[PDB]
Amino acid sequence: PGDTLCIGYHANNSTDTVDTVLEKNVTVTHSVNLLEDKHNGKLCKLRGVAPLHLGKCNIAGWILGNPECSSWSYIVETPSSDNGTCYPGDFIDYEELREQLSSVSSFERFEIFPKTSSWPNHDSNKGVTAACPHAGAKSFYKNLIWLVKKGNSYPKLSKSYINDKGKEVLVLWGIHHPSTSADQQSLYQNADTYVFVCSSRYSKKFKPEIAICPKVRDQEGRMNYYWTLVEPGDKITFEATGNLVVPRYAFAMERNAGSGIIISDTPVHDCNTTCQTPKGAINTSLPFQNIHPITIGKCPKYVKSTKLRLATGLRNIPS
Amino acid sequence: DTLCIGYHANNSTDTVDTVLEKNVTVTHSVNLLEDKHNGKLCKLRGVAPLHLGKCNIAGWILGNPECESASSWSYIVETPSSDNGTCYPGDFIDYEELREQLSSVSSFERFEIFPKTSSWPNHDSNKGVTAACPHAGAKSFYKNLIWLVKKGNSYPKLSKSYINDKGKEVLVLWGIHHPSTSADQQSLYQNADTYVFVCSSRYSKKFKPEIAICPKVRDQEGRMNYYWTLVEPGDKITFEATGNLVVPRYAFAMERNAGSGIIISDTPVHDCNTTCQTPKGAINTSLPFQNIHPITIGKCPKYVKSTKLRLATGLRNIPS
Amino acid sequence: DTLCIGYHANNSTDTVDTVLEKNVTVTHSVNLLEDKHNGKLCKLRGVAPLHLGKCNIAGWILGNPECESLSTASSWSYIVETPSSDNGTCYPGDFIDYEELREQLSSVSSFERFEIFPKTSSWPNHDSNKGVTAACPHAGAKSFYKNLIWLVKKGNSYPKLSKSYINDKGKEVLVLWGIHHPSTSADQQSLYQNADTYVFVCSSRYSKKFKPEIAICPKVRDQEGRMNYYWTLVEPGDKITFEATGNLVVPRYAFAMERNAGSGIIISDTPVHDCNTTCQTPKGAINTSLPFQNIHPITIGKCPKYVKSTKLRLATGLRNIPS
Amino acid sequence: GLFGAIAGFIEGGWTGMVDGWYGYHHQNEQGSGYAADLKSTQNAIDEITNKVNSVIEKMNTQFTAVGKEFNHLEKRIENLNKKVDDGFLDIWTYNAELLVLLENERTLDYHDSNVKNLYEKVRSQLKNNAKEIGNGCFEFYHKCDNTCMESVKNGTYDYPKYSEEAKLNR
Amino acid sequence: GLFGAIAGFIEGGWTGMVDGWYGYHHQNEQGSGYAADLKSTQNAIDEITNKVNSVIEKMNTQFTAVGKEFNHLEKRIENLNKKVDDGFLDIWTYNAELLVLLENERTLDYHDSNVKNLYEKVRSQLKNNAKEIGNGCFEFYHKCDNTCMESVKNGTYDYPKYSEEAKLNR
Amino acid sequence: GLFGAIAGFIEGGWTGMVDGWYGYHHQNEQGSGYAADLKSTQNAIDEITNKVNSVIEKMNTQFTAVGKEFNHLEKRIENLNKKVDDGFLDIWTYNAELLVLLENERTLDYHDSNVKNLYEKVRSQLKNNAKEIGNGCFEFYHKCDNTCMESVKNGTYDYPKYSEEAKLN
Numbered sequence A: 001p002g003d004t005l006c007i008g009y010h011a012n013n014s015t016d017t018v019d020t021v022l023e024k025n026v027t028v029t030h031s032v033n034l035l036e037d038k039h040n041g042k043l044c045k046l047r048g049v050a051p052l053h054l055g056k057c058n059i060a061g062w063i064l065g066n067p068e069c070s071s072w073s074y075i076v077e078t079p080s081s082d083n084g085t086c087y088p089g090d091f092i093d094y095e096e097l098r099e100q101l102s103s104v105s106s107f108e109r110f111e112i113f114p115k116t117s118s119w120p121n122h123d124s125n126k127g128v129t130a131a132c133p134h135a136g137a138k139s140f141y142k143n144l145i146w147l148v149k150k151g152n153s154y155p156k157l158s159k160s161y162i163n164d165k166g167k168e169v170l171v172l173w174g175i176h177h178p179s180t181s182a183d184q185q186s187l188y189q190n191a192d193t194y195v196f197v198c199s200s201r202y203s204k205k206f207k208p209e210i211a212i213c214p215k216v217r218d219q220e221g222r223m224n225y226y227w228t229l230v231e232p233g234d235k236i237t238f239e240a241t242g243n244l245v246v247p248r249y250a251f252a253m254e255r256n257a258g259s260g261i262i263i264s265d266t267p268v269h270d271c272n273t274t275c276q277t278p279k280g281a282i283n284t285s286l287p288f289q290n291i292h293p294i295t296i297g298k299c300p301k302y303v304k305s306t307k308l309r310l311a312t313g314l315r316n317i318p319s
Numbered sequence B: 001d002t003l004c005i006g007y008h009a010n011n012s013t014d015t016v017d018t019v020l021e022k023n024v025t026v027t028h029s030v031n032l033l034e035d036k037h038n039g040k041l042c043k044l045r046g047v048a049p050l051h052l053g054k055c056n057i058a059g060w061i062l063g064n065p066e067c068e069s070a071s072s073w074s075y076i077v078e079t080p081s082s083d084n085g086t087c088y089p090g091d092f093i094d095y096e097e098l099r100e101q102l103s104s105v106s107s108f109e110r111f112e113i114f115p116k117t118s119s120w121p122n123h124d125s126n127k128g129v130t131a132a133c134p135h136a137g138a139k140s141f142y143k144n145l146i147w148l149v150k151k152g153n154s155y156p157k158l159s160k161s162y163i164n165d166k167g168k169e170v171l172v173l174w175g176i177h178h179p180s181t182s183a184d185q186q187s188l189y190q191n192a193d194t195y196v197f198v199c200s201s202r203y204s205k206k207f208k209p210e211i212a213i214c215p216k217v218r219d220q221e222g223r224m225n226y227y228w229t230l231v232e233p234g235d236k237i238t239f240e241a242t243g244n245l246v247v248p249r250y251a252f253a254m255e256r257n258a259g260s261g262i263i264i265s266d267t268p269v270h271d272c273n274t275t276c277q278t279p280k281g282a283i284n285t286s287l288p289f290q291n292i293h294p295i296t297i298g299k300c301p302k303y304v305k306s307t308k309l310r311l312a313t314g315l316r317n318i319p320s
Numbered sequence C: 001d002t003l004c005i006g007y008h009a010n011n012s013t014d015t016v017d018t019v020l021e022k023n024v025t026v027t028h029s030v031n032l033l034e035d036k037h038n039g040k041l042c043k044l045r046g047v048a049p050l051h052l053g054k055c056n057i058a059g060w061i062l063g064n065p066e067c068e069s070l071s072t073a074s075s076w077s078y079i080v081e082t083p084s085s086d087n088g089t090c091y092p093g094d095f096i097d098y099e100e101l102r103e104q105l106s107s108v109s110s111f112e113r114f115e116i117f118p119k120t121s122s123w124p125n126h127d128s129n130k131g132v133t134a135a136c137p138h139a140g141a142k143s144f145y146k147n148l149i150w151l152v153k154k155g156n157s158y159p160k161l162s163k164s165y166i167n168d169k170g171k172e173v174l175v176l177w178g179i180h181h182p183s184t185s186a187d188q189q190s191l192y193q194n195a196d197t198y199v200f201v202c203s204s205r206y207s208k209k210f211k212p213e214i215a216i217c218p219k220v221r222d223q224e225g226r227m228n229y230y231w232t233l234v235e236p237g238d239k240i241t242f243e244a245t246g247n248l249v250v251p252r253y254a255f256a257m258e259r260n261a262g263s264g265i266i267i268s269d270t271p272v273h274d275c276n277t278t279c280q281t282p283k284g285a286i287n288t289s290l291p292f293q294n295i296h297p298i299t300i301g302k303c304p305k306y307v308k309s310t311k312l313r314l315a316t317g318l319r320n321i322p323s
Numbered sequence D, E: 001g002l003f004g005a006i007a008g009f010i011e012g013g014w015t016g017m018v019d020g021w022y023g024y025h026h027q028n029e030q031g032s033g034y035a036a037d038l039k040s041t042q043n044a045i046d047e048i049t050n051k052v053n054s055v056i057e058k059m060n061t062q063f064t065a066v067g068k069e070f071n072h073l074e075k076r077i078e079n080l081n082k083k084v085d086d087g088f089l090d091i092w093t094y095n096a097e098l099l100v101l102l103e104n105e106r107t108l109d110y111h112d113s114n115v116k117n118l119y120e121k122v123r124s125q126l127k128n129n130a131k132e133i134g135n136g137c138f139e140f141y142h143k144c145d146n147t148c149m150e151s152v153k154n155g156t157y158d159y160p161k162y163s164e165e166a167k168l169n170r
Numbered sequence F: 001g002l003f004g005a006i007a008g009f010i011e012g013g014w015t016g017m018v019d020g021w022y023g024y025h026h027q028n029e030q031g032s033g034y035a036a037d038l039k040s041t042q043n044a045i046d047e048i049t050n051k052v053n054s055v056i057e058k059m060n061t062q063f064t065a066v067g068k069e070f071n072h073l074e075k076r077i078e079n080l081n082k083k084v085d086d087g088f089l090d091i092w093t094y095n096a097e098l099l100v101l102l103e104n105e106r107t108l109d110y111h112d113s114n115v116k117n118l119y120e121k122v123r124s125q126l127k128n129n130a131k132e133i134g135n136g137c138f139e140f141y142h143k144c145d146n147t148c149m150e151s152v153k154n155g156t157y158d159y160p161k162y163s164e165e166a167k168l169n
């Protein structure tokens, strides 16, 4: 005969389950995932700045003027990118240069040693090779000039540049090591030669290492590539009696603390993100992520978790 | 007529700490801290390690006569008392890197890359021994290299290439000798002002003898520097010298394996299996934490400096 | 007739956050975050730091005329440079493995400077009394590093130089030397006579051959030439030999030392004091039992963990409801 | 389970109560139905919401480019890098996994508590003017219409007003 | 204790009750003795085992060599490697130590909760027909034989059946 | 609150009670006043300080010189070093933050529990000889003086020695 007031709790049609230290697979009325497990499958801008995509080339091929190849948040290379160095040899401190170029604001290519007036006593046209072909013709890097003797003589060259860009200047050059004596004389005349490069910080002398190495792109000789960063007010000096692949174009740039290089075939797109992955971008709301351990930007922490469901509601008991 | 509610108590002396109170005697508990090991060096992934006995990695890979010695190993073991390495004093270039890269191989084959009998018809390949690398007390040398000297007062320019027809990386080691005096240089190589050039499709370096009298080490005032490189499948490596070259004789085709380690311990190796190895012994545990050793190899529990990590399962024991 | 069961309340305005609620007032509470420091550089584990004043490590170790050369304690727990330390390698060049040296000198339990090659008796066939430069001025005069000697030709010849040092000290000896690279061939001859030269330095573990690299480089401190600096550690009982036909800036003073583990280098204007600490920061020492700190990420010693937190209010009392 | 209410003495939940987490079902002369207690529900919402945003917003992430490039003579530092990434990996996986197990257990206990307190808060008002028939239900000893019911639901219940009558039907 | 029972208003344990963690001590005619409530005990065993398994199984670590070798000109990177190893050590040590301190307290609150719940499950059934004589005991106001006790433990205590007798003995 | 006492059935705290965290307020014919329950206030103080000490003393760190110097051609390992310091920064900042949040919750819940347990303790004594008039207050169904008012506080109260007086009221 009694009137009744019952106290109770909400139940619904939810099938969400969570795990607790005490029990597994507990169905709950409401929950949320702490684990971000979805990405937009795109390479987007970071901090609203687009990445630098290198097309089919790598950084060497791009930074040297390989015939076949303003600011950015990171760099993208495709896994099947072509060789950068066409003429075989060593790119000294290559990983470091890549790292230091990974992210920059302000970046300007300029002709540091103008081709027309910088080398009156040397030939700046004949320096082409079958190693660096372009449209059926022997060619060479655009950013360097392979100087050779003009009419049977190669005089001592001495050339200096003063950095008047209010920022670092990247300068790259090559050192040529002919395969044999004849090639040495054919190119530079002098037989026994040296190259010297020095700034207020950098200083190195080079001498050709004449030898017949395994043929790579029809070259038994070798070309080694070098770079340095000239501080704003500083001067850099080149001196040579042969074998010097001089700078033509250099790069004034402002380096940012640093990001990285993403090597992926994932398409680049006009989107924004705070966290980039090689597989695609992820919107950083959640604290954890299982897309990819290799990320760039302000990212969730990578975990090997498949599910991180956080209970917000109570145990669901419809019965 | 009475009915009471109560909880169990027993003869338990186990204790655990809680955030609110220390030394709480509980009825039942469990340890989360692995502190036991088997004092053995065991197998990883079912694969036994490479024990080098009294020799180090340098003396083993170079063929030091004192190390006469599988084709696979999960890691390398060096006894703390392993002197036997570079018997002829010198600099072993990128030695640490080589050690690391040899820590685990899934396949390993020693082959004669430059057959001794047919490779050097214009040079002497028999007088290349020293008291610094003795075999049974007699002047000897690394078994895997050959110290070439002039023949009949003449050292012709030598040029020899190898093409990697193996289906894997080939480890190639060689040396560059530096006589202490111009008299020795000429006595060994004749030419006085020589050079050595080594280059593959990746590698390239020129060597020039550096002649000076340096402090005696194992009675030698001169020095011999050792070099190595991995030749990729299909690649070629070329040696060219007018003297001072210690040519390769045996090289190693190999399949490098992820990345393992080198344990330097006196701990005996046995016929046991493990997933986590310590220099002091193997850890066979399902527990999440461990205090045996920080330097482990494999799938191991985390290292903590805890002495006790006791988890309460039962309740506070109050027999009364 | 009543009896009541109640709980404390007070004037306290302290506030803490819980996972469930923000700014909850509580009766009592403590901070788990150390946010204070003493604004001093202190002795670490009871040993004073080495403070280099207006010199950096390079200038001190080489004996730049502006630096104070031992003097220098026989031991220190870490090294302090000021952000204004100007005097280092007064003669322009490269300091090979510089960072390694700085790290390895950061903490020493024993350190002694000694004249490895007496200036007077060591070089009878060369001139050891002209090696000074305007790049390294002193009391308003040409000078040079105190721990090196810039050997020059005697009269008009530079004979083959060969000198060794055996380590009779009971411990490691740090030896430093230079290689001079003149700007021109004429300067080369004017200094060392011989136009083509070499330098050799070897011990039982170290070995390197140097060749002069003559070129006109950008003028730094009026020098178009360069001087590279090298060092190595000669273990007890071993010998180090120098051989040269020119271009060798010979050691004059070396250092017997016993290096400790770890430690680092602080670059700061923060005053050194006669205080003791277990945790040192570039801006001040930390004295606390708290497990967390937000003073500075770069610390030396047995320190609290660095965090970005601004506060870590830990409740001890109860929810404060004065009503 | 920690507070005995949810899946305890109140065995099951109500699909019929669709406007809140905790509430009542009344049954009187004027009719019956479900009604979620808005106070305790909104408070639980504000707090569980604060809980979620806490586990999320306290994750200050530094700007980082995880990837590094090493050449063939840098396997050692490459492996060091690996150890760093793998070390952070194991640390975050383990903590995230436990954080969720542990917080999920606290969350359920928290709701359990909220129900327990709601039951016993109603029980302190009614006292002996109703009987605890179980399953979280109260069978009144007096007659409790709508205005009476709502007075119980929202704190302002008048006990003395029904003391006379409650005593009778016992 | 957080729930008041264990080492609280129930001051000691029962060695007699060897058959479980929580139970009852009944006394009427016919006999008496200890008996564990296997239901709340098995649940407790299951859940605590899942707790221990949770702390253990959630580790599952990466394969790593840890050991690195550096030469006399690689002191900076050797010291970085050391900072990594020590960093992980301070993290795992502190985390392990706290996990055990925190969870141990939780486990105790849990046993305490299970008891408090048992006690209240009995209290709500009896009500008038018995006296709450403290220390966790209830003195009946009516003869309560085996099947009566078993009834209270089983939650099907028939209050009306003994209502009449109970009132009189009061 | 988790136990429904603090800010629950006992709405507020007592500024007037200063000698303890929890306690009593009596009001009999003789007089009134506040009096903190010592044994329980002390235990809570023993256990909280232990909680604070434990959080502090379990942090036993290694001697470490965090700083590192890398030249202009060691940018990669410099950044690796940055990743280590940053990773430790994120792990410890998050852990410290949540530790405080979660333990503050538990501490407040702790006190709430102590209050409730004390209340249920005296309720376990005044059984039939008193009425729970609400707000954590008991109104004695008999008349209690100071000597009696201290038997309740000490756990030695005597029910049978009042059961006769109470039965009539």
Ligand SMILES: *[C@@H]1O[C@H](CO)[C@@H](O[C@@H]2O[C@H](CO)[C@@H](O)[C@H](O)[C@H]2NC(C)=O)[C@H](O)[C@H]1NC(C)=O
Pocket (backbone or CB within 6 Å): A080, A081, A082, A083, A085, A088, A216, B232
């Ligand atoms: C130029 O690029 C080619 C690929 O386009 C490179 O070929 C690879 O060589 C590396 C070893 O150096 C192997 O790991 C790859 O498997 C090769 N790719 C294939 C499938 O052929 C080549 O190394 C590059 N050449 C130069 C001059 O650097």
Ligand SMILES: *[C@@H]1O[C@H](CO)[C@@H](O[C@@H]2O[C@H](CO)[C@@H](O)[C@H](O)[C@H]2NC(C)=O)[C@H](O)[C@H]1NC(C)=O
Pocket (backbone or CB within 6 Å): C064, C065, C066, C086, C087, C088, C090, C135, C136, C137, C138
């Ligand atoms: C030490 O550093 C000081 C500057 O702090 C140098 O002093 C300057 O020297 C130049 C060159 O002779 C003079 O023109 C300036 O007048 C000096 N400036 C000051 C502030 O006095 C000094 O050269 C350095 N000494 C060495 C050897 O490194």
Ligand SMILES: *[C@@H]1O[C@H](CO)[C@@H](O)[C@H](O)[C@H]1NC(C)=O
Pocket (backbone or CB within 6 Å): A045, A047, A048, A272, A273
């Ligand atoms: C990209 O996002 C950033 C902020 O994340 C913003 O500054 C910028 O304007 C955005 N650009 C576009 C195209 O939305």
Ligand SMILES: *[C@@H]1O[C@H](CO)[C@@H](O)[C@H](O)[C@H]1NC(C)=O
Pocket (backbone or CB within 6 Å): C275, C276, C277, C287, C288
């Ligand atoms: C640390 O603090 C205590 C006071 O808490 C003080 O006595 C002591 O001198 C301090 N130690 C140092 C070396 O600053």
Ligand SMILES: *[C@@H]1O[C@H](CO)[C@@H](O)[C@H](O)[C@H]1NC(C)=O
Pocket (backbone or CB within 6 Å): E150, E151, E154, E155, E156
């Ligand atoms: C125990 O309770 C169940 C219903 O939950 C009932 O079917 C069974 O008969 C009861 N046992 C006893 C002892 O009455």
